[PDB]
Symmetry: D2
C-alpha cells in the first residue's frame, strides 16, 4: 500500500519493543477500565462518579472548532526557503539577508469555496499560503494559484463569497447567484477566463503556480522604496486534469490533493517552487497605463521581467493534521522590516480581516499555538491576560509604556516608509475602470484555438443553469472582451437550451 | 426549473410592487454606499473611519459556528404529529392525550460520519431526529434509520466515531481504522450487516424508516410503567440506490437529499411516516432471552407486534437553513411526563452528552434560539444570566428556591417512576454477550440469495483495503455468525487480492 | 425601608392573587421535585438520569460573562431625550428634527478603573454613556464626567489603563505605576488637576456633568459641516463628597450610586441633564491657538458659548440588571446621518476598539440583545449566520450585493462629508504639544484658595506612596504648570515623608 | 517599603546590566514606534495600515475572562507537601507512599461570595483549595476554612449562592434573600453559628484552618476501604479581626489577604499547615448516630481522634497573577488511586460541576494551561482536537480504543472500590434530618459567655435588615437550637428595631 494508508502500521513499527503507555484521564490519573461504565448492577443506571466517562465524553463534545469562512478544505506541508540571488538593493528583510540562507516555512493549500469534506478536484481558485519563520518575526505570504482576483474593492468580498457558496434557504449551490454577481461585476472577466481555462482544475498542489497577487513595497537599508509582485512557479511543471478525470476523482478520492502531497513527501519526491519578483519604480507606477495596485491586472513580462530570489522546498508532512494544518493562521499584516503594504484597496482590507477572524476561530491567544508562534524570534510587549494563555504571560514585567523600569523599548530602525497622498478622503468608484484589455490579450495571445474552445464549453456548461437574462448579461460582457469569445459561448448556450 | 433553483426569483416575485429596503449597518444606521471604501484620494490607503466596511467584514469573519461532531451534513423540515390511536393506558403524555391532537414537529435528517460539504448518497447510518413541541415542554426523539447501533456501552462511542472519521496524521478515511474497531468489537455484526445491505444507501430521506432504537419507559396516570420501542416507518415505501447510481450522484449532486426533500415539500407531495410502538412488561423484560435494554438487539415482531399511535407529516421547508437547521438542537434528555429513560447504558450516556455539546456548539443559552425554544409551553425557573441572553431573563423574580415571595413551585405530579435495582455499583463487562443469534436470523430469514450476494460484495469491496490480519479477524466474526456469510466474503476478498 | 430593599416584597405584591407558576427545566418540562437529588437509596451515589440537577448546575456554571476591560462597575437607567431648541441649521439628524421630539435613551454610569464589586465612592473619572434609539439607528454618546482625558494618542490607552489597574505579579494597586505613567506623560496634568479637585468624588451619578469630550462633526441638509462639543450638565446641581465621607461610604455602602439612582427613580424624583453644544467653524478650527481636536484641551466659554438643544430625563429603573445594564453595549461608531467623527486621534481609536471588544464580551450577534437592538429602526443588510442568532436571519433574502432580486439598496443621501487632508501618511509626535496653559488657567481662575489647598493635599496624599524620583518628576510637571502648585505639593510631600 | 510595593524596582534590579528587549508585535515583528498612530498628516484620520495599533488594541479588548461564579476574589501561593507519618495501611496513594516524600502543591485562598474587586476582610466562608502534583496525576483537595457547609443536597447550591449574592433587579446585597433562604433551610444553623462566631473574619489566610469538609474513601493496596476527613490546621495559630478592625481594613486595604500572603512569603516567613485525618470504618459508618456523609455534621474528636500525615508549606509567590492564580482550576474529581468519593450527595454534585464550569471559564483544553497541567505525570489517551490546543495533540497515535497498534492500554490495578447499595433509585428527603444537636454542643461547650454574646450581636446586626416574619422564622430556629441563643438574638433585634 501507499505510505498514506500505512500510517498506523508505521506508528506501531517505530514504537515497537516498548510496552503500551498507561491510559490516563486529562489530569494524569490512571484509568482502571475504559470499555465499561459504572452501573447499579448489570442492568442498572449510569453513576455520576463515572468521572472517566464524563471526562472522555465532555472532551469529545468540544472537538469541533469553526472551519475557515473561506479556504476550509486544505492540505498542509512544511520545509524551507533557500535564497539563491541577492535582492538586498530592493529589500533589507532578514529573510533576504545573504545567499544560501534557509528560513523554515509552513504552507497550506486549499480550495476557496469548498467546505471541510468537499471534493478536492473541482473548478475553483486554489489557495497557496506560505508562513516564513524569519528572525524578524513571521512573514505570511497568503497567495493564490492565480496572479489576479475577481474584484478590486474589499467591501464586495463578503458578497462575492456568499454568491460562490450555498443558497441561504435551500442550502444548495446556485449558478443563478454566481453568474448574477459575475455579470453585474464585469471586472471579474479576467479571473473568470483563468478559472474556466485548463488551469481551473490543477492536477494536485505540486503542479500549480503561486502568486502574492498584490503589489507589495520593498524598502532597502538606504530607505528607498519600490513596488513588487511575488511569483512562485512550480518546478514539477503545470499539469491539469480533464473535466471527466476531475469528475471521476470527485467520487473516487475526494482527498486527492491531501493524498498526493502526503505520498510525494513520504516517498522523498520533495516538490519545489522557484521564488521570483517583478520590480516597479514609483515613476513607472505613476506612468503605468492601468492602476498598478489593481488586483484584476497583471504586470506584463516584457515590460517587467521576473527576477529570481530563491526556491521553496516542502520536505516534512504534518505529524497531527488538526494541530499543524487546521489551527495554522496566516496574517497578511505579518510583514517583517523591508516588506510593507501598497495602496491596493484589497490588501488594505486583508490587513484588518485576518487577525479578526483568527481571534474568533482559534481564540484571542492564537499566536501561542505552536505552528503560529514566531519561535525563531523573541516577542516582548505590553500585551497581557486573555483566555487560554499558555506562556508565563511575560512574568512580572511592567505592563505599561512608557515606564522607568527597563521594559521593552521601540526600535526606531523599524519605522514605516512615509509617502504623500493627494486627493480628498472619500469613496472613489473603481467599477468603471478597464475590464477587457488584458482579458482580450490573454484570450487571443496566450490561449490557442482548442484552449479557446475548451474555455467556452467550460463557461457554457456552468452558465447554462442561470436564468436567460443573466446568460445575456454574461455573454454581453464576454462579447465586449472579444466577439468570438461571446459568440462561441452564445452558440453553445443555445445548443444547451 | 425545479422549485429549489427558483428560490431567488420566487423571493423577488413575492416581494414585487414594493421598493427595496434601505441598506443599514447592524445598528440600523443607513449606508450611503457599500460598493467602495474610503481612501486618501483615488489610489490612497483605507481609513479606520470606514465603519461600514469594518462592521460588514467583522460579521463576515464570525459567520462559522462549530459543525456537529457527528451528523454534521443534514437536511431539515417542519410539520406536525397527528394522534390516530389511543395509548393513554400506556402513557400519560400530553402528546398522546386524545385522538386527532396535532403537535408541531421539527425534523433533521443526516449522515453520521460525513462533514459539512460531504456527499449525501454514501453508505452510512442516516440520522432521523424529531422535536415534538408538546404543551409539557419539547420532546426530542433522536432516532436512526436502523433499529440498532454498532456498540452497547457509551464509553466506546468516541472510539467508534474516531475510527469512522479521518486519520489524525493523513486526514484521510482509513478502512484499517474502521475494520480494526469492528473486528475487535463483534457486537457490531448486526448493525454492519444492516449497513452493507441494500438499505445502507436509501434513495433520499423520504424512503427510509425511523427508529428510537432505545427501550423507553411509558408511565400512565395510574403510575404503572412499561417498556417501549418507537418505530416510524415510511408511507412512501422503502427505496434504495444501487452502488453505481449512488457513486454517480456523489459527483452529480452531493446535496441529493436536501434537493429531494425541498422539491417534495415545495411541489406539495408531503412525505409521511406512521408512528408505531412495541410494548414490553417488566415480567417480560425479566424473562426476555437477551438483555431487552441491549441497543444491538431488536424485539421480534411475532413476540412484540407493532401498535399504531399516529402519523408524522412534513409540510413546511426551512425559511433560512442556518437559523432553522444548522442551529436546531435535539436533547434525548428532553422527555415530557409519561416518557422516561430505561436502564439502557447507551441512552444513559446520551442524557449527559447532548446538552454538554450544545453549550459548546451553539452557546449556554441555546434554548433561547427560536427553533430550540419550547414556545408551546411556559418556562419559569431559577436559571439566570449567561452569555447572549435574549429574554427579560425572568425580570425581577426571586432567583433562589425555596423562597417566601410566590416564585415558581415544583409540581409533585411530575415525579419520576421509582424502581429497585440489584447488584454492586461497578463496571460490568457486556462485550462477551450474544453477538450472532439475531444476525444469523436476519441473514437466513430476511435476506434472499441475491440480497446475500450483494451484502457480501459490499462488505468485501470495503474490507479489501484493510490489512490481512484485520480481514481474517473480520471474516472469522462473519463465519461465527454463519459459515456461508464468512466463506462468501473470504472468496470475494481472495479474488480482490 | 427604601424602595431598593423592598424589591422582593413589591414583586410578591404586584403578583398577589395568582398561584405560583410551574417550575420547569429550560426545555419547558415540569420539575417534579427540585430540593432532592436521585440516589441509589437514602445514602447512595447520584444518578446521571438526574437531568433536572445537571441542567440547573450546567446553567449555574455558565452564568459569568467577561466584565468590561474598563468601566466594569456600573449603574443603568432608562428615559427619554426631549428637543427644546432648533439646531437644524447645524445638523440634519432625525434626533434633532423638530422641537418637542422625544427619543428613548438608555444610560450607564460607571467608574473607569474599578472591577465588578469595587466601591462606588472613590476618586476616579465617572463614565456617562447615553444610547439614543433614533429612527436612523442607535446613537451612542459614550461620555465622561470630565470634558478632557489624560492622553491625546489612542496607542497609549492600554498602557494608561494597565498603570491605573493592579500590578501583574502582586495583584495590588501600585501608586508607583500610576505616577510613573503620569510623570512621563505630562499632557495628563489637566485631567489630573480635575480628578484631584472636589469633582473627583461626586455625590452619586445625579450630581455630575456629562461631556462627549471629543470634537464631533455636525452636517446640515445643505451639506455644510461644523465642529461640535456635547455637554450635558446636571439640573440637580454639582455636589461632591468629602474624602472622609467617601472613605466611610466605601465600607458602609460600596453600591452607593446604584442605590441612589434606584431610590431616586423609584420615589419619582427623576434626575435630568440639559443638553448643550459648542459650535466651531472650519476657519475657526484652522485659526484656533491649540489643536481643536486635542482631547486634553477644552473650548473656552467666552469664545465658544453653550447652545441649548434639549434635556435628558431618566424615569425608568432596569427590570433585570444583567439583561439591561451588564449586557448593554455602547459603540461610538454608532452615529446617525448628520453626526460624524472629527480627526481627533482618540475618537479614531474608539471607532475600532468598541465593536471589537463587544464581539468578545457579549458575542458576534450582540446587537440582537434587546437593549442593544435598534428597535425604532428597520435593519436590512447582507450580514448573515453567526453564533447565537435570534432573528429569522433575514429569511430567504439574497445574501450578496449587487444583485438582481430587489434586495436592500444603499441610500445615496447617507454619504459621509468629504474633506481634503494635507501632509504625509506617517506617525506625528504630539507629546511635545502645550500641556500647561489651560491647566494654569483652571488653577488660578476657576479654583479658589481653599480649593487649591484641598487639590494639593489630595495629590500629595496619593503621590506620597510613589518612589522619590517619581515624586520629583511629578512635582516638576506641577511646578511647570504653576510654581505655587508645585511648591505646595512639595511641602506636603516633605511633611508626609 | 514592603516587598509587595517594590515589585517593579526589584524587577529592574534583577534585570540590571542588560539593554531593554526590542518591542515587537505578537507575531515577533519589531515595532518602530508605539507612542503615535499613523495619520494623514498632523491632524488627519487614522490609517488601517496601523497594524501595530489594531494588534495592541485587539488584544487589550480580549483581556477579561469570566470570573469564577463563586470564590472570584482570591490569593495564590505555591510550595510542597511533606509526609511525616505512615498511613499506607489506610491508602495506597503515591502522595502518601513513604516518609519524607515532597509533592509540589498550588494553593488558592478566596472568599466565597465576593466578586473580583470586593474587600478581603469581610464575614464570609474562606476557600482553601490545594492542588497536589502527584506522580499518579493531580490531586485537588478543594476545601473551606470550616469543616461543614450550609446545605446537604447539591440541587440547593445555585439557590444558596443566588441568595448570598446581589438582587437581580437592584444589583444590591439583600439580607432579605440571605435570611429567607437560611430561615427556610434550618440545616444551615451549624455553619451560620460558625460564620457569625469570631472565626467568620480571620486575620489573613495564614491564621485559618482548612478542611476537606466531605467524607472521602481511602483504599489500601490490599483492597480494604475506610472513610476519611482531611484537616489542615494552621501552625501560625488561629487569629481573627474584630468587626471594627475588619470594617476599617475594608476601606484602608481591600487586598489585605493578598498583601499579607505576598509579604509573608517575600520576607521568608513561610506559613505552614499540619495535615491530619480522621478514620471511620464501614461498621462505625453504619452505627454512627447521624449520617456520616452529612456535610452539615462533624466527627467528634473524642470518638474520632486526628491522625497526623504531613505538613503543607507555602514558600513561592506567583510570578504573574493572571497566569498562575486567575487561570488555576481545581477539580474535586481529580483523585489519584487510593482516594475515592463517598456517597456524600454534595461531593457527588461537585464531581460534575467543576470540569463543566472550567470548560466555560478557561476553555475545553484548560488542562493544557501550565498551572493546571499534571507535569509530574505522563498523560496518554484517545482525547483529541479542541479549541486552543497547545500540545502535539498526541501526534499520529491511533485515536480509537480498542485497537491493534500498541496505543495506551487501561491499567487494571487502578479500578474503583465496588460496594453494594440498598434502597430504590429515587429522591430521598434530607431536610427533616437532625439540625440542632451538634449546633447546641458547639454553642454550650466550645463557645464561652463573651463569645456567645459577640455571636448573638453579629447575627442580630446582620438579621435586623430582614423583614419581621423572616426575623421570627430565624429566631425560632435559633430558639430550637437553644433557648438562650434565640432569646439573646430576639432581645438585640428588639433593641435594633
Ligand atoms: C454542591 C456543592 C458545590 C457546588 C455545586 C460548587 C460549585 C463550585 C463552582 C462552580 C466553583 C467555581 C470554580 C471555577 O469556576 O473555577 C466552585 C469553586 C469553589 N468551591 Fe465549590 N461548590 C460546591 C461546594 C463546595 C464545598 C463543600 C466546598 C468546600 C468544602 C467548596 C469550595 C470551593 C472552593 C474553595 C472554590 C474555589 C476554587 C478556586 O480556588 O479556584 N465548594 N465551586
Amino acid at each position: 500500500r501507499d505510505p498514506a494508508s500505512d500510517q498506523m502500521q508505521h506508528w506501531k513499527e517505530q514504537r515497537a519493543a516498548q510496552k503500551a503507555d498507561v491510559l490516563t484521564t486529562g489530569a494524569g490519573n490512571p484509568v482502571g477500565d475504559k470499555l465499561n461504565v459504572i452501573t447499579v448492577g448489570p442492568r442498572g443506571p449510569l453513576l455520576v462518579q463515572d468521572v472517566v466517562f464524563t471526562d472522555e465524553m465532555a472532551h469529545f463534545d468540544r472537538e469541533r472548532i469553526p472551519e475557515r469562512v473561506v479556504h476550509a478544505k486544505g492540505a498542509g506541508a512544511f520545509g524551507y526557503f533557500e535564497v539563491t540571488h541577492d535582492i538586498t538593493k530592493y529589500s533589507k528583510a532578514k529573510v533576504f539577508e545573504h545567499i544560501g540562507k534557509k528560513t523554515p516555512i509552513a504552507v497550506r493549500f486549499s480550495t476557496v469555496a469548498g467546505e471541510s469534506g468537499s471534493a478536492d478536484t473541482v473548478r475553483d481558485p486554489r489557495g497557496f499560503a506560505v508562513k516564513f519563520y524569519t528572525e524578524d518575526g513571521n512573514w505570511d505570504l497568503v497567495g493564490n494559484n492565480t496572479p489576479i482576483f475577481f474584484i478590486r474593492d474589499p467591501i464586495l468580498f463578503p458578497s462575492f463569497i456568499h454568491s460562490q457558496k450555498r443558497n441561504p434557504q435551500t442550502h444548495l449551490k446556485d449558478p443563478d447567484m454566481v453568474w448574477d454577481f459575475w455579470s453585474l461585476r464585469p471586472e471579474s472577466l479576467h479571473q473568470v477566463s483563468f478559472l474556466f481555462s485548463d488551469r481551473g482544475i490543477p492536477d494536485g498542489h505540486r503542479h500549480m503556480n503561486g502568486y502574492g497577487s498584490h503589489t507589495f513595497k520593498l524598502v532597502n537599508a538606504n530607505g528607498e522604496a519600490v513596488y513588487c509582485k511575488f511569483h512562485y512557479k512550480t518546478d514539477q511543471g503545470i499539469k491539469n486534469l480533464s473535466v471527466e478525470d476531475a469528475a471521476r476523482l470527485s467520487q473516487e478520492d475526494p482527498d486527492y490533493g491531501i493524498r498526493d502531497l502526503f505520498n510525494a513527501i513520504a516517498t522523498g519526491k520533495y516538490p519545489s517552487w522557484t521564488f521570483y519578483i517583478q520590480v516597479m519604480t514609483f515613476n513607472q507606477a505613476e506612468t503605468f497605463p492601468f492602476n498598478p495596485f489593481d488586483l484584476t491586472k497583471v504586470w506584463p513580462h516584457k515590460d517587467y521581467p521576473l527576477i529570481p530570489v530563491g526556491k521553496l522546498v516542502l520536505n516534512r508532512n504534518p505529524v497531527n493534521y488538526f494541530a499543524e494544518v487546521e489551527q495554522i493562521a496566516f496574517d497578511p499584516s505579518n510583514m517583517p522590516p523591508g516588506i510593507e503594504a501598497s495602496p491596493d484597496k484589497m490588501l488594505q482590507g486583508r490587513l484588518f480581516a485576518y487577525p479578526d477572524t483568527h481571534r474568533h476561530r482559534l481564540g484571542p491567544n492564537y499566536l501561542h499555538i505552536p505552528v503560529n508562534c514566531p519561535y525563531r524570534a523573541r516577542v516582548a510587549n505590553y500585551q497581557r491576560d486573555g483566555p487560554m494563555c499558555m506562556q508565563d504571560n511575560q512574568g512580572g514585567a511592567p505592563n505599561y509604556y512608557p515606564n522607568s523600569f527597563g521594559a521593552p523599548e521601540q526600535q526606531p530602525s523599524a519605522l514605516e516608509h512615509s509617502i504623500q497622498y493627494s486627493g480628498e478622503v472619500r469613496r472613489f468608484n473603481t467599477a468603471n475602470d478597464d475590464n477587457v484589455t488584458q482579458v482580450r490579450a490573454f484570450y487571443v495571445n496566450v490561449l490557442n484555438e482548442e484552449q479557446r474552445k475548451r474555455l467556452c464549453e467550460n463557461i457554457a456548461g456552468h452558465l447554462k443553469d442561470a436564468q436567460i437574462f443573466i446568460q445575456k448579461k454574461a455573454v454581453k460582457n464576454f462579447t465586449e472582451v472579444h466577439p468570438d469569445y461571446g459568440s462561441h459561448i452564445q452558440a453553445l448556450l443555445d445548443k444547451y437550451n
